[PDB]
Design a protein around this nucleic acid. Structure first.
Ligand SMILES: [Zn+2]
Ligand SMILES: [Zn+2]
Ligand SMILES: [Zn+2]
Lengths: 101, 167, 39, 55, 176, 113
RNA sequence: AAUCAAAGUUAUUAUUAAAUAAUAUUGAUUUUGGAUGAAUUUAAUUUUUAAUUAUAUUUUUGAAUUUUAAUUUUAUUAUUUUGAUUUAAUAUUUUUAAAAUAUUAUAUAUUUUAGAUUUAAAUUUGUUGUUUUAUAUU
RNA sequence: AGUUUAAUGUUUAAAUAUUUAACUAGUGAUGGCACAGUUGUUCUAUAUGUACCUAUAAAAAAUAGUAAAAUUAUUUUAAU
RNA sequence: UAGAUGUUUAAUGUUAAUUAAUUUAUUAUUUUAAUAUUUAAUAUUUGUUUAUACAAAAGUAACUUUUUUUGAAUAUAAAGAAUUAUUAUUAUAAAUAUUAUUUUAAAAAUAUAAAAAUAUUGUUAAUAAAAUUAUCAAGUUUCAAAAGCGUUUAUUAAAU
RNA sequence: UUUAUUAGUAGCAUAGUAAUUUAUUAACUGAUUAUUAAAGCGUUCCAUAGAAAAUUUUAAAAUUAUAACAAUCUAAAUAAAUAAUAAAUUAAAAUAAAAAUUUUAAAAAAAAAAAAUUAAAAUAGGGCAAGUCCUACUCUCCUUU
RNA sequence: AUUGAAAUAAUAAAAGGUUCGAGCAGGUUAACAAGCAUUAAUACUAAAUGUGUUUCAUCGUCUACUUAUUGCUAAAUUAUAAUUGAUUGUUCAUCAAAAAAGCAAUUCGUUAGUUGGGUUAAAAUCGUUGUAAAGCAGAUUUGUUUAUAUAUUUAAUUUUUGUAUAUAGUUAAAAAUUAAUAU
């Protein structure tokens, strides 16, 4: 807090973890791990897979207000849109794998 | 004649006959009455005498495929105290090769029976026949990389180890 | 139910030494003038 | 409180030198020659001139 | 309270009772020693323990051999929820010779839905340390660039980085 | 403003004899908190020790992404769930650092060019 | 130090309520069944959605009571087409929200200080203000 | 590591929570649906059957003058 | 002064035949219901720093455009204690993320106890079943009275 | 007066701290002997283990002695609730009272901690009155199987 | 008017007492525990913490324990606590105590009364009250008024002589170890 007046600001955001700037997809290419998947490891699993999760209400985005257009939860938080290909491919059992007749 | 003669079993964990029945008889020296009592085992077995590392000529007991050296916890490394015979250290199994070989389901409660270099389920390896469990069939509940086996075996003073107080 | 830290009957209020001197009335009464003449 | 207080009870509150000294005192101030803003003594700005030589 | 017959598999931990007993965990390792040690404990699981009563009658002997597991195709065909009149084995088959196929009861499918969500979990962990062993692995590799560029700069600018004194206080190898 | 705690400005003594903070200005904080501090124009011709100013932007590099611009957008939702007065909605919190603010700095590393 | 008695006006917006009236009434707030029905069934001799002009009788002595009123004759279960009539009621919200007199070592508001004191209601079974209720505004 | 005690809490973070003692081995059981109010259930304590079992919900004008609380309008014109 | 010897309202107050000053005099010391005070210069509140699992009930204050499958259809974030509260909802699975809400210059009590010589129950109805500890957290013994080990709303020679 | 076996001052109607013995410096403890126990008694009695007592003994909880703040729990600035509230300018203080505990009456004086008083309390504790409740049995009475 | 009994954790609406400005029956006969005239005073004891009295020659009132927590004695420490009065919401709950039981006891029973083990005991302090305080001070104090007062767990001196079968009396040292001023 180098503020002189604390607030929702001048709260030094990470007074640790100085090894910033991780190029995930670039690093994910070295590991050969489906770039869309690796980036999902580093955000709460609520945000990517079809899991029970708790969302903040401002995060949900408001209806079209007189002051502001309808701000959908996606167009303000693109990298939080769940990827249901990546869910299904990983988490759910496909009809295929148990098709017996 | 203090009256309430039937009671709660109020003592019991406040006895000296207890303090001797709470100990663990592990593979250490720790003569007795000095091993840990409530959790039954000391955390962080120090092993400076012998480094206790995973070997290079390591392989799955059940499957026999070579095992990743140490970069991973895909292998269930059961060091049965000092083993030597199964490998330089104890038996080794990838997490998915940890099933009973004969009946092919999981090793219930994880007690297995090394039948001629292929881990057999104790019940089948014992002759019994009830051959399907309820919870998870083909994968045991085991921990990985000895993390479930470090409740027992070879705590720090594994021997006389009097080099300490001698000159 | 005994042994007070504060032994004695030193009263609370009567301490002025001019209108209530700490002198036993046995030894103080001998000054009460019962033949008082000038006033 | 086993009684409500008439104003003359609430008004005695405003006589002790505790109410007065806490609320009803004007602060002594002056114009910071560098910032031209009112200022108390012993306090300065976050600014080089105000910080090297105390205005 | 969510009758156990609703859960796909009966629950792992089974809470009981006992006002005067406070411990979450069911005491396994006791339910295990009995059962492994005593054959009788668990009902015979009819077939593997039938097939006697059908050898004794047709052969005049005790079977005196290990009974085959995996009940023969055609046995327990009217039963519907066998699971007890068996071991937890599947309903054996039709009376056919087609290759064995698991009759995909709601239970078998759930187990498939575990062994995919087990491979899912062990895969989300296996490659956290794989990228964690780049971040810290490459942070060090970069940090040593820092101590090198600091190492180079601290020679031309001569900042010995060892106090206000000259090296003559170092050469003594005392504190001073 | 959040409580009557006093605020002192503890600064190290002479910096004109320093090597890292030679002629910096502290009359005001950095604009975005990952931006290096304003310099006294009379000594604008100062360069720094590289190990100090090459590890800084290593740290300041994580806020120049968009994943932090999502953690910035997001945080403004927390402070509203926790209701903190005067917090703009995460819909009008356009990023701190941006591509227009990219072009200057990569061309401000002309030293390594 | 101590007191000093003290502010009655928002400003601005328009078709409910209640009884009454003796004409309708198969169950108010989506589109049965959607195989073809068997799954969308409420009915029976009792003060009942049926509501009866007397004081004498008679009666477990003491809570029990009067019989067609004119035989299809009108005391009968009720609204749109006078903001449906009439009489009683009248608001509810939006934002309004204010004010200058009594000492100077102390009993309680009157200017001239002194005099002055149950706060009431009940309860007082004159155990005679007997231990109860009341913050205030409307 | 959730439960026979004790401290704190006492309109408390709780119309039962924090810390803690005790206890803890249930192939015989928090649990498929099943029993309902003059009655179910009860390893029985007049205990519980939706946060006081005096069940809730509903419908009454029960009784309360037989020491409960009240009972609305100054300036009067015959006593006990 | 002013009828008289003390307890049953005075009303053409717009001529309820009204029409520019009716100056409305009539208002229940408690009851509920609505406001407003006192307690209150307050009790609570205070956000400075970071050790990962995935089900179903439960909600639906709910934004939308976003690339589900190769199934037709169908639907995927949010509870309960009155709350954004004590509060891992443990159906599962996994094991190195530098995931990120806690004001502040004092002594009384008090919640509480690090530290520390003697003494060991003289305190008290009665010490000894009474948090954690790397100094690794455990009293021993005798006698008398006392069954089963399950089970209980004031928790036991209760009832099994 | 079943009272024989058996234990018996015992969860044993009083009598009591039972009388003896120990034990303790001090024995309303507890254990022992016996033994007519107000009216234990054969389902008695013994045996008895973690319980509750009594000793002996040892012992860290800050047990008396004994007092001994290291820790965390500001003020101020901000938000603004609760019990209670007839009033107070009297409230003190002393004394008499008269029905009462005293509170009055009278005389005569003269900000923050603590809980002595005001109602610091909640709510338990009584007993009486009328009302209703609920349970019980040779004597009251139906619906009764 | 058509039987007799219960505490049922009895209750609901009321007032009114067990513990008192006055009464009653069983302690050496007689002075004393204390079943009826008030009234949210809401149990005895302990802990802590006070107090006004009154009581012979200075002058006077600090004992700690054991058993039981009943209360008050017994009795051990050489020698052993004056008597009244007002006192305990601050602290405990041991007792007394509300179907959890049980024993003997009374009951036809429901149950009743001795005894033992069980059994929440509690709110932000507004007024008075009092302890402190109000940041002040070159200075204790005229008079108000005083939480503050040298001893009651006994030695060794020294005079053991005076007096008579044993023997006094001022004091001192030590011990109980602590100092106290609002304009
Ligand atoms: Zn393997
Ligand atoms: Zn097997
Ligand atoms: Zn300035």
């Amino acid at each position: 807090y180098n503020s002189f007046e604390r607030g929702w600001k001048d709260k030094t955001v990470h007074p640790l973890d100085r090894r910033g700037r991780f190029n995930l997809d670039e690093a994910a290419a070295e590991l050969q791990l489906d770039e869309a998947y690796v980036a999902s490891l580093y955000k709460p699993l609520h945000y990517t897979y079809s899991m029970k999760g708790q969302r903040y209400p401002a995060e949900q985005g408001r209806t079209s207000r007189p002051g502001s257009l309808a701000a959908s939860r996606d167009r303000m938080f693109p990298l939080y849109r769940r990827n249901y290909k990546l869910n299904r491919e990983l988490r759910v059992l496909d009809h295929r794998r148990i098709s017996t007749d | 004649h203090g009256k309430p003669a039937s009671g709660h079993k109020v003592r019991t964990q406040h006895s000296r006959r207890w303090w001797m029945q709470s100990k663990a008889h592990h593979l250490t020296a720790v003569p007795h009455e000095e091993a840990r009592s409530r959790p039954h085992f000391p955390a962080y077995t120090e092993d400076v005498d012998q480094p206790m590392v995973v070997p290079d000529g390591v392989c799955c007991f059940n499957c026999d495929k070579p095992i990743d050296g140490d970069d991973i916890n895909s292998y269930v490394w059961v060091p049965s105290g000092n083993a030597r015979v199964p490998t330089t250290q104890g038996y080794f199994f990838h997490v998915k090769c940890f099933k009973c070989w004969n009946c092919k389901y999981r090793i219930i409660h994880n007690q297995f029976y090394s039948k001629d270099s292929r881990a057999w389920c104790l019940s089948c390896a014992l002759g019994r026949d009830i051959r399907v469990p309820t919870r998870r069939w083909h994968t045991s509940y085991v921990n990985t990389h000895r993390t479930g086996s470090r409740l027992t075996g070879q705590f720090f003073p594994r021997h006389r180890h009097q080099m300490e107080f001698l000159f | 139910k005994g042994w007070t830290h504060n032994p004695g009957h030193t009263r609370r209020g009567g301490k002025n030494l001019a209108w209530r001197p700490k002198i036993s009335d046995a030894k103080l009464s001998q000054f009460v003038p019962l033949a008082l003449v000038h006033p | 409180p086993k009684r409500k207080k008439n104003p003359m009870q609430l008004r005695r509150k405003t006589y002790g030198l505790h109410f007065k000294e806490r609320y009803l005192k004007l602060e002594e101030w002056y114009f910071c020659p560098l910032c031209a803003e009112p200022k108390k003594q012993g306090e300065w700005c976050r600014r080089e001139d105000c910080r090297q030589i105390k205005p | 309270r969510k009758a156990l017959q609703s859960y796909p598999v009966p629950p792992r931990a089974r809470n009981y009772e006992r006002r005067w007993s406070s411990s979450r965990t069911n005491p396994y390792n006791r339910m295990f020693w009995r059962t492994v040690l005593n054959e009788d404990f668990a009902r015979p699981s009819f077939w593997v323990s039938d097939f006697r009563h059908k050898y004794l009658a047709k052969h005049g002997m005790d079977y005196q051999g290990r009974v085959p597991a995996s009940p023969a195709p055609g046995m327990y065909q009217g039963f519907s929820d066998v699971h007890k009149i068996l071991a937890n084995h599947p309903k054996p088959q039709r009376e056919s010779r087609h290759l064995p196929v698991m009759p995909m009861t709601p239970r078998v499918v759930f187990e498939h839905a575990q062994e995919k969500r087990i491979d899912y979990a062990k895969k989300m962990h296996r490659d956290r340390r794989l990228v964690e062993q780049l971040r810290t692995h490459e942070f060090w590799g970069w940090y040593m660039k820092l101590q090198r560029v600091r190492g180079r700069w601290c020679k031309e600018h001569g900042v010995s980085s060892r106090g206000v004194y000259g090296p003559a206080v170092d050469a003594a190898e005392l504190w001073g | 403003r959040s409580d009557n705690v006093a605020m002192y400005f503890v600064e190290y003594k002479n910096r004109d004899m320093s090597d890292n903070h030679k002629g910096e200005d502290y009359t005001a904080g950095p604009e975005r908190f990952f931006l290096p501090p304003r310099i006294i124009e009379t000594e604008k011709g100062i360069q720094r020790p590289p190990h100090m100013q090459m590890a800084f932007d290593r740290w300041a590099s994580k806020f120049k992404t968009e994943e932090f611009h999502h953690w910035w957008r997001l945080r403004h939702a927390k402070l509203r769930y926790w209701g903190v007065r005067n917090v703009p909605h995460p819909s009008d919190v356009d990023p701190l650092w941006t591509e227009k603010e990219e072009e200057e700095w990569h061309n401000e590393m002309l030293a390594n060019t």
